Design a protein around this ligand. Structure first.
Ligand SMILES: Nc1nc2c(ncn2[C@@H]2O[C@H](CO)[C@@H](O)[C@H]2O)c(=O)[nH]1
Ligand SMILES: Nc1nc2c(ncn2[C@@H]2O[C@H](CO)[C@@H](O)[C@H]2O)c(=O)[nH]1
Ligand SMILES: Nc1nc2c(ncn2[C@@H]2O[C@H](CO)[C@@H](O)[C@H]2O)c(=O)[nH]1
Ligand SMILES: Nc1nc2c(ncn2[C@@H]2O[C@H](CO)[C@@H](O)[C@H]2O)c(=O)[nH]1
Ligand SMILES: Nc1nc2c(ncn2[C@@H]2O[C@H](CO)[C@@H](O)[C@H]2O)c(=O)[nH]1
Ligand SMILES: Nc1nc2c(ncn2[C@@H]2O[C@H](CO)[C@@H](O)[C@H]2O)c(=O)[nH]1
Lengths: 232, 235, 231, 230, 234, 231
């Protein structure tokens, strides 16, 4: 690995991955005896314990290309179970800010990364691990958190998401938009990793405002449910 | 109005078990209370009756995405909105035995044709079944103590273009079996607002040509599984 | 060993008239001498008999390219090598009336899974019928004084996505009708070495007849096709 | 006004025999009665004269789809509506001999720029000749006792990329020869409403005397002219 | 070679390539003791001297498939440096007829020729030789000629270039449209040839209200040819 | 902007963009009175002066999607001139570690990002600003730095770059591989920004360097880039 310079043995088999380095640092305060095992290229990785289990929290940056590199290197250091915890923009009006979306599949446009890894443009089913996803639903229900289960569209161009865009994807059965799930699910299917994803709704493209104190609380509550699942 | 499924108003139930083979539609109809044949046009047999006191239908969809799309579209026009496909499949991994079941979590497919016509472009839309309904099937099958696996399948359009290279390609991509209608079922359902799921009976194993099963043992498997599916549709 | 068409080898003729509707296969079998039902599996009815001093079979192919591909492949494994599809179609031009016929000279299609799986890439391989066989059809229909038009058709994969925008698009591309199996039939036949053709009965005009007038049209056309198959 | 074919309106016939080589256009013009050179701009030689009671033109189209598309479009703007391409080709099957003829029934092609610009998407529109006109060609060649074969051809865009793997791929796809302009001719004609067809002279066999070739080219040209005026 | 029938040593290493054979013959008058080395299939090729340097002027016809054949055969005959000198239609209103465009890259729709040569649909960078292109800039500025530097769209369908077409390509950074540059640049990068292109603006699709006469245009072609030949013999 | 939380006026019109946050911090020491104007999501942005001009040094992360977001937001805050200074893997054996590559174009695989922005799969010419690129060549020559001018392939999958890969792209006129140039150039053409790129060779995929020799290389090239940006 040339991006994540963590020593083997410093990365856990169970990893909670987030796009924002700031979130990784904030969430590391939920672990027992957290240690920073990497900061190279801004990809902060922390390792500690939770519920009698060793767990790491890693930063993946923005986009498929970035998360693909991070996952490949974490896997080379020992990781094989990944739960992405990010933020997303809702594509339907009934979902409120601060609520959660447990992902069951990812839509995506063919090309680049997918062509290079798959060798052709076939539409491979981009889905998370069945069991791990059901465990997430169980954990979020236990903590009485408001969630929705559905597919999301993994976009590669944040600034090309206009109004035509929103009705198009919502009409295709997607309830939110983000940028890394399709890459995570497909690469995991190919590499044999167990992955899942939970997202915090930070905006609604179909429809409200969220402070930041209510948002930080949302992030924190969801993180605890994710860690519960990872260490089950 | 429908031009293939010639049924009248109120004859088609909201919940439907769809199968590809008309022979299987007829055989499974014997599991219902007072089965009535509501359609036979173009060979697409459809039966309507009761199971556990609930009204339900069993419909034939023929082979391939173009065929099942027409049948789903017309059944929906007749009032159907919940579909559980119950078919057969060829396993793509060595550890799955004949007669066992696969509860589908998603479908891989090659772009083009039907999808381009419905989606208007070549984006890879997530082709997945209804989350809740799929979990209900898992519960139902484990209750009847039936051996099943949960995973993705590849929905092929060319039965006779499935060679060895084919098997390693799709199995390496997270698919554990191959059939021909799930991708169309799931995608059209997501776009139309229908609730769908799929359970398949393993009738062959492309990764293990040495194993075989008789129609007696297979028919037995089909029957046991049909009960589990019907329990779910009427839950 | 075929898993859809369970007819015993020798029970399928080298010459086959294929139709999508099982009901039509049953009805047309009455045009053969000493007709025998050689297959019923999966609803794919297949009858074999004689006509004009030759053995001939009438087979059901179902709806769509994936369905007809399977049927053609298995009939061929059983000895068939000449296929003439007889179906129904919706005209894309206003001057063609219901009940008239269309002898197909080529098929337009959208790039898709079936063609990619068989061709291995996205090349637009010419999807055309056998030239000689197609001319024989023209001769047979002309002999029976039947009104027909020759031209290309679009083989759609999605019946319920054919809107008005659809009609202008394909008619401006040189197609005079729409159906769902010709492209698959023609392309597979060229790759496999089979001799194939197609005649269609216009049952609807998307740009502009009693069940008794239609039924007569179907029957009259079937006779022309059988004459061709045994010419 | 057309910017490549500078012929005056009336100087181009409704019936046109099109060839890729300007040298062939010139040579074949001697088969016409009272031939007149109506254009030479950009090297696209066009002659117009008479044959069997009808006015007929012989036009040069250059090499490749982009070139023939431009020539056909401008000839049409000048009054042409029936086109028969007469070219040379390389057989893809060993049983066809040099100097023999191939009457084209369809053209295979790779999806590409020209087709996308004209069709607006990647659909594989049937690239076929006019059925009636093609049958007339068969009749003319048969009457002159010439040896021909009917079949599909692959319209290649890259002459120098046709390796051995190439021969196997296209021959197994139902094509009996390779050339470069038929797909463009057929598809554009179907969209524009023109009546077109093609006859080819086999100048090489990729699977297996110039005095005999000249004879073959001339004999075929007469059969094509008979067809255009039939 | 089966199209360009020249013998060993008759084709120069440096070649000025043009689409119109009429232009090839006309420009040959700028050479010392020009000799016609080929006329087969209409592809006129002349070889002579400029500034005491041996060079050739060759015809390539219209379109990617045509220029590919010509370049491949000229290269088989010994050519390795190509400078295309043709005509083009501007896609922006501020460019006047008779002015010049020095090409920095070519946009194109995938398929056909590119798929056959590249074996897939990757968008390979279609650009000219860096050094040669800068030589042309120096030469044109030296002869005080008005020119613009930018990318062009290499179209395959002349009669499918409507107005929507103009806004689409101009919004993508292309200032003109022609039909051979993408093929020239890509094939050169793959084959190892040194190539570049200068185009004379003969029309403006963004401004249909401007025109030029064959007199003023011929003068434009001539002046530009001198600058190109100066570069080819530098 | 929701990623780069800097106020308009804190981002310069001239920007030197790098992928590594650490490089941005290191290179900021070359500016006069550097100020950190953003750190959100890890995208460090510094703004200071150099040769009488105001300039910013911004972090863009890894990949097309990431740099596209950063460029769009920097532009919304006033930026219109961008010079990417990154690292790259050489695809040809004659280029040594620590040497530089001035980019003249970028090859790429269609799909995703490009389809969303361009609305189709056309291969738009992904090239830098002609003038700005020539200014870079002049600056590197002046500082007697060893450089090569050529095209690069912008890959989206770092871990799919095998041996077959190297020969393929090298045979297509590309002398190095990186991941952001195609996005930078194409988006710049569409948005009307002036962009260019210089890369430090950190690996050679066709054919070693410590780190001190490398840091020296990065530093020397950064000064040449800043000279170009402020000319
Ligand atoms: N494309 C997209 N990504 C979003 C949105 N909201 C949050 N994200 C996530 O946050 C980052 C971009 O802001 C990416 O890592 C995305 O996964 C949104 O509305 N659109
Ligand atoms: N392509 C394919 N379809 C299968 C297989 N086994 C069962 N099927 C199903 O059965 C029919 C074809 O035999 C289709 O309706 C398929 O869904 C198999 O191995 N391959
Ligand atoms: N897509 C389509 N198929 C048609 C039409 N009319 C008849 N068919 C044929 O009939 C069946 C569907 O009704 C298919 O097997 C088609 O070949 C039509 O208007 N559209
Ligand atoms: N691609 C190709 N074109 C050929 C061949 N033989 C003749 N041609 C024709 O001749 C010209 C190229 O020599 C083009 O106009 C083609 O139509 C061949 O073997 N391959
Ligand atoms: N497609 C196109 N080619 C042009 C234009 N102006 C000049 N050409 C060139 O001239 C020929 C076609 O007229 C081709 O060789 C082109 O390179 C134009 O506006 N559009
Ligand atoms: N794909 C790729 N990117 C590289 C390489 N060397 C450096 N990079 C750059 O460094 C990051 C990935 O290591 C991306 O931002 C690339 O632009 C290489 O060999 N391959």
């Amino acid at each position: 690995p040339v991006h994540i310079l963590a020593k083997k043995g410093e990365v856990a088999e169970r990893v909670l991955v987030v796009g924002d380095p700031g979130r990784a640092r904030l969430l590391s305060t939920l672990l027992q005896n957290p240690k920073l095992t990497n900061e190279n290229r801004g990809f902060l990785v922390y390792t500690g314990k939770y519920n009698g289990e060793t767990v790491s929290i890693a930063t993946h940056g923005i986009g498929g290309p970035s998360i693909a590199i991070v996952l490949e290197e974490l896997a080379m250091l020992g990781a094989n179970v990944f739960i992405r915890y990010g933020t997303t923009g809702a594509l339907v009006p009934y979902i409120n800010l601060g609520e959660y979306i447990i992902v069951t599949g990812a839509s995506y446009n063919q090309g680049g990364l997918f062509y290079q890894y798959l060798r052709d443009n076939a539409c491979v089913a981009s889905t998370p691990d069945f069991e791990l996803t059901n465990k997430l639903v169980t954990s979020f229900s236990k903590r009485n958190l408001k969630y929705y289960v559905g597919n999301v569209f993994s976009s590669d161009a944040f600034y090309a998401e206009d109004e035509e865009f929103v009705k198009k994807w919502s009409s295709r059965g997607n309830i939110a938009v983000e940028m890394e799930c399709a890459t995570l699910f497909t690469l995991s299917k190919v590499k044999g990793w167990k992955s899942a994803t939970v997202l915090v709704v930070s905006d609604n493209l179909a429809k409200i405002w969220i402070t930041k104190e209510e948002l930080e609380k949302s992030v924190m509550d969801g993180a605890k449910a994710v860690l519960d699942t990872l260490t089950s």
